[PDB]
Amino acid sequence: AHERRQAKIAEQIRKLEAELVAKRAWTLAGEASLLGEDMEFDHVGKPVPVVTEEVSESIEELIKRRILAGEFDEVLRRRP
Amino acid sequence: MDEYSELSGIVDPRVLVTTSRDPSSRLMAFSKEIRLMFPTAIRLNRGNLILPDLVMSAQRERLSDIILLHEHRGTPTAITISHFPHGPTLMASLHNVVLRADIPKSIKGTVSESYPHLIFEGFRTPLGQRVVKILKHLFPPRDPTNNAKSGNRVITFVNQDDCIEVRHHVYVRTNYNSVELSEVGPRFTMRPFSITMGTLE
């Protein structure tokens, strides 16, 4: 009677621990092995700012820089 | 080893783009512009399709990735990317969405669908490098020889704190030391919030 209640409590504890562990994995990987388990973050208390025209303009300058310097990040073909 | 290392650089990815059920006209327009970024992507109308039936068919046909676009009250709100056969799955929220027709100075005319270059800027953490790997492998590999000199299209991902600005441009090399960009769209901000090690059911 009192020990089936304990089963449900332990179920809640296990579920809360699983959430906590997935959040700690996210936090740790975002600091600079660390990429082997599920990770999540709840950004709840943060809005996302609008992107100013200044920022989009500097992105354009970044792109021109990369093109003229030949600095590209896609995967390159290889032989198996 | 990871989920990408065996085939990375050897095969072109085969990507499927789709939406939640009953998509708004805005979500449909966004899904076409998302599709256009990915030269080896097909787009499947969601119809009445049940997601487990969709995932199983894509698995059967040996597709490599699914991109699923979600919305709320008529606005695109999230993107789910899942790599086949067995993971990983990335989810991110969507913000500041701007379609091509609403971008000042966006190209008009046809967009050539050459294999694009990619630019990843500012992913200075293991989490950031994991996201780059997931995104990068949605695009086919390019020939390394004279790569730095060829091409005419680029998709750009710029990470600042926890958000990623995404852009899509064609360009003309007007001289050895000058380039003109023409923006294709869409614009949007992506904020990753989950990376799990498996796939969709």
Residue numbers in the entry:
A (entry chain B): 475 to 506, 515 to 562
B (entry chain A): 74 to 274
Task: Kindly provide excerpts from the paper associated with this entry.
The Mpp10 complex, consisting of the long disordered protein Mpp10, the uS4-like factor Imp3, and the Brix-domain protein Imp4 was identified at the center of the 90S pre-ribosome adjacent to the UTP-B module and close to the 5’ region of the U3 snoRNA. Mpp10, and its bona fide binding partners Imp3 and Imp4 have been shown to be involved in chaperoning U3::pre-18S rRNA hybrid formation by destabilization of the intramolecular box A/A’ helix of the U3 snoRNA and stabilization of the U3-hybridized state. The heterotrimeric Mpp10-Imp3-Imp4 complex is an essential 90S module, which is localized at the core of the 90S pre-ribosome adjacent to the UTP-B complex. We propose that Mpp10, positioned at the 90S core, provides an assembly scaffold with linear interaction motifs for the different members of this pentameric module.
